[PDB]
């Protein structure tokens, strides 16, 4: 039929994938063991009898995170060939995850993903998860995309990556790693969505009433976005949006593809008791700077085309009035050479809840993917962080010692400057 392949790389990918497959299995009604107590086939394969197996590949260069799944409840769900573990991690070193260690396991990895696609008759895209700061998320993720570009060609490769936060930082060598991975992402990826932990933390505190969240709560938020993102292929609705429609509608040029994500309503039980949450309200919640999952102000730049997806008992008349109302907002700036500005989507399957969850049981919800020049503010930040370290040659010896050439450091800086030129030139006057 129609189907998507999910690959999880590094801790930040597989830990999100744990939350995604919990949500996916419980939404369709499959027990964690893979049996039953429809749209099953877009994400699972039916081995026979009454058992189901996901289309997922779990990979990290160190076995601690993966062995949690092998020992956890979901151990009965996955096929052990899918669960791939290396020996020693990349030590937050791009060169170690790309040049020395990465090439030891890449060909074993590529056989499994290709094998999984043979059972896949109607493949239409890939979903890949990264963390930019990590050695494996950036070093090995770059090596993965470079090969999949020639292995599969003109198939949309969508990514879900955690972009480094403005102030919250857990790796000192983080600014070095993002620029190196930026060069490899920019040519091969069809479109890569942006999220960051710093905005998710504030969102997980203000709207959802949690005093002290963990990585677990943030992972359920991201799983909801992907579930809403892929629901058009699974459930019935009124305006279906395929994977290829994202590729053309969202990105105007080759190198301006990076979007940002949003979701609404994200609300607790007590507040949703008071709020009506009709179509007009949820559409207004999307455009506030607080709901953005990237801590960048949209008011700094301007908007290119955005894509809107509605899940619930939503009537098309209300959708048109909402966006027409949005166009009346003079605080929202759109670029003149995009007077169309929008694509809509409607589906009938409401959002789904989880035991021990954090969210409210709403009848309708909307998910937003937006392309804006505001994230040029984010790149100029990361470029400046790189400049201070490399001016004094702050961490070059570690990268060069593991096979990396120094010549890549200025080149990766050069490509980013071209990207910085491309954004404000796009945002320039008609």
């Amino acid at each position: 039929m129609r189907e998507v392949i999910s690959i999880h790389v590094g801790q930040a990918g597989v830990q999100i994938g744990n939350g995604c497959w919990e949500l996916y299995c419980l939404e369709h009604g499959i027990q964690p063991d893979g049996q039953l107590p429809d749209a099953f086939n877009t994400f699972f394969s039916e081995t026979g009898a009454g058992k189901h197996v996901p289309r997922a590949v779990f990979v990290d260069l160190e076995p601690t995170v993966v062995d949690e799944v092998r020992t956890g409840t979901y151990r009965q769900l996955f096929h052990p060939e899918q669960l791939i573990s290396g020996k020693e991690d990349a030590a937050n070193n791009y060169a170690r995850g790309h040049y020395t260690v990465g090439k030891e396991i890449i060909d074993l990895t590529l056989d499994r993903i290709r094998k999984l696609a043979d059972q896949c008759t109607g493949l239409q895209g890939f979903l890949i998860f990264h963390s930019f700061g990590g050695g494996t998320g950036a070093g090995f993720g770059s090596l993965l995309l470079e090969r999949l570009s020639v292995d599969y060609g003109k198939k949309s490769k969508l990514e879900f990556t955690v972009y480094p936060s403005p102030q919250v930082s857990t790796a000192i060598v983080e600014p070095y790693n993002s620029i190196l991975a930026t060069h490899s992402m920019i040519d091969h990826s069809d479109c890569a969505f942006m999220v960051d932990n710093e905005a998710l933390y504030d969102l997980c505190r203000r709207a959802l009433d949690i005093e002290r969240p963990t990585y677990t709560n943030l992972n359920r938020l991201i799983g909801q976005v992907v579930s809403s993102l892929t629901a058009s292929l699974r459930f019935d609705g009124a305006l279906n949006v395929d994977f290829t429609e994202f590729q053309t509608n969202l990105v105007p040029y080759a190198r301006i593809h990076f979007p940002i994500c949003s979701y609404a309503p994200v609300i607790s039980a007590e507040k949703a008791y008071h709020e009506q949450l009709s179509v007009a309200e949820i559409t207004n919640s999307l455009f506030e700077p607080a709901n953005m999952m990237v801590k960048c102000d949209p008011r700094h730049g301007k908007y290119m085309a955005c894509t809107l997806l509605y899940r619930g008992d939503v009537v098309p008349k209300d959708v048109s009035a909402a966006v027409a109302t949005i166009k009346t907002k003079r605080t929202i700036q759109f670029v003149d050479w995009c007077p169309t500005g929008f694509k809509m989507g409607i589906n009938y399957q409401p959002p789904t809840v989880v035991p021990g969850g954090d969210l409210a049981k709403v009848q309708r919800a909307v998910c937003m993917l937006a392309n804006t020049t505001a994230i040029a503010e984010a790149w100029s930040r990361l470029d400046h962080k790189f400049d201070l370290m490399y001016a004094k040659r702050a961490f070059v010896h570690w990268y060069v010692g593991e096979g990396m050439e120094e010549a890549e450091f200025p080149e990766a800086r050069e490509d980013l400057a071209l990207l910085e030129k491309d954004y404000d030139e796009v945002a320039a006057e008609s």
Binding site: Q15, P63, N93, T214
Partner: protein
């Protein structure tokens, strides 16, 4: 599967390691007879890091014991956990220590080194993987200061890739227990700078000051001091043994903390510590651990961070806690105290979290920092060496072992160059 080889050389190293195995065995739940009697399945997940299993459910550590005289080996043999170790791993000479660096490095070291290296070899080649080595020694003695450097050079020759992390104790600034330490420490510094990837410096005096000020211990024996130091070894490698939300092994730490090849000496610390009876006055939370970790009094080395500036810092957290709480605390301490951190490195504080805290604590933390304040300590030993060397004085006892006077000038030259390199990067 990231096995680590542990070596104990000298009196100071041997006794610290003896207490260090009591900490691990309790944390894993291994009976002193070497058998498992623990309480959780998670303890048997990755016991292979530190232990070998003998057929019959008897677990044996990867430990090698070295000394020049048999006095300390018999002391460990009579210890509570003495039967744990493998008897063939006990390697020792039959001569007095001599408290002489040249004698240990040249006269007795060479005959022992060829046997010691083969003792390393059975254990290092026996395991599936080998990430790094672990050495405990002093830098004021004759056996640890001299023979430890000799083995470190040889281990670098055979195993270039592996992480040669060592744990050292520096001679004290006010009162010390040996007349001729400045000669010993200066000669050893040349070897450690070039061969060892990670060196942690600990001062006995700061250990006493922590004992009175926080622990209130009126008479701190060497058991308490070694136990406090044993906490830091247990904290650093805990990320290998237990799962967590954000893993950070040894090589993650080296790449993050070390900006340049020669600046890799570290100061360490631990939190929380219990004031007797006053723990009923304290509400332990994640912010409280942050207060102790970056409190300068809890530092285990007698070099004041406030007189210098920081380059990199790293904190581990153990227990079930919020990840937002951890990341907000690191940002808070870095923003409130901008004066002590360098501009050309943003985000000077690394963080990590582990799931399982040690027994007796529902949460615990470990702090490792790298700062320019090491210039205070190296000025101390250089000054005593200078006024001793001008008079010549006790060189008479090192020359009659085969050490040229040219080696003293070279040793000072490299030591002084290390001090200048910290001076320059303060700008």
């Amino acid at each position: 599967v990231r096995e680590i080889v542990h070596i104990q050389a000298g009196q100071c190293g041997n006794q610290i390691g003896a207490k260090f195995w009591e900490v691990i065995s309790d944390e894993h739940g291994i009976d002193p007879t070497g058998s498992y009697h623990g309480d959780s399945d998670l303890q048997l997940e990755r016991i292979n890091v530190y232990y070998n299993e003998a057929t019959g459910g008897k677990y044996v550590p990867r430990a090698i014991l070295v000394d020049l005289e048999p006095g300390t080996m018999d002391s460990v043999r009579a210890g509570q956990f003495g039967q744990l170790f493998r008897p063939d791993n006990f390697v020792f000479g039959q001569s007095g220590a001599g408290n002489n660096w040249a004698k240990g490095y040249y006269t007795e070291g060479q005959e022992l080194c060829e046997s010691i290296l083969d003792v390393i070899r059975k254990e290092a080649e026996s395991c599936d993987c080998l990430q790094g080595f672990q050495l405990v020694h002093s830098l004021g003695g004759g056996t640890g200061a001299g023979l430890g450097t000799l083995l470190l050079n040889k281990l670098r020759e055979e195993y270039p890739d592996r992480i040669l992390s060592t744990y050292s104790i520096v001679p004290s600034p006010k009162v010390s227990d040996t007349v001729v330490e400045p000669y010993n420490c200066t000669l050893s510094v040349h070897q450690l700078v070039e061969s060892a990837d990670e060196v942690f410096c600990i001062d006995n005096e700061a250990l006493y000051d922590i004992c009175f000020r926080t622990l209130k211990l009126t008479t701190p024996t060497y058991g308490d001091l070694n136990h406090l130091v044993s906490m830091v070894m247990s904290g650093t490698t805990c990320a290998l043994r237990f799962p967590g939300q954000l893993n950070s092994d040894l090589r993650k730490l080296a790449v993050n903390l070390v900006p340049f090849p020669r600046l890799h000496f570290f100061i360490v610390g631990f939190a929380p510590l219990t004031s007797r009876g006053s723990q009923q006055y304290r509400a332990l939370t994640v912010p409280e651990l942050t207060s102790q970790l970056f409190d300068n009094k809890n530092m285990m080395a007698a070099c004041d961070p406030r007189r210098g500036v920081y380059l990199t810092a790293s904190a581990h957290f153990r227990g079930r806690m919020s990840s937002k709480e951890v990341d907000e605390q690191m940002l808070n301490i870095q923003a409130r105290n901008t004066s002590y951190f360098v501009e050309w490195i943003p985000s000077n504080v690394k963080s990590a979290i582990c799931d399982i805290p040690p027994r007796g604590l529902k949460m615990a933390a470990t702090f490792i920092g790298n700062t320019t304040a090491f210039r205070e300590l190296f000025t101390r030993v250089d000054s005593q060496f200078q006024k001793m060397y001008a008079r010549r004085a006790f060189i008479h006892w090192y020359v009659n072992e085969g050490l040229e006077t040219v080696e003293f000038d070279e040793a000072r030259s490299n030591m002084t160059d290390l001090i200048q390199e910290y001076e320059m990067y303060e700008t």
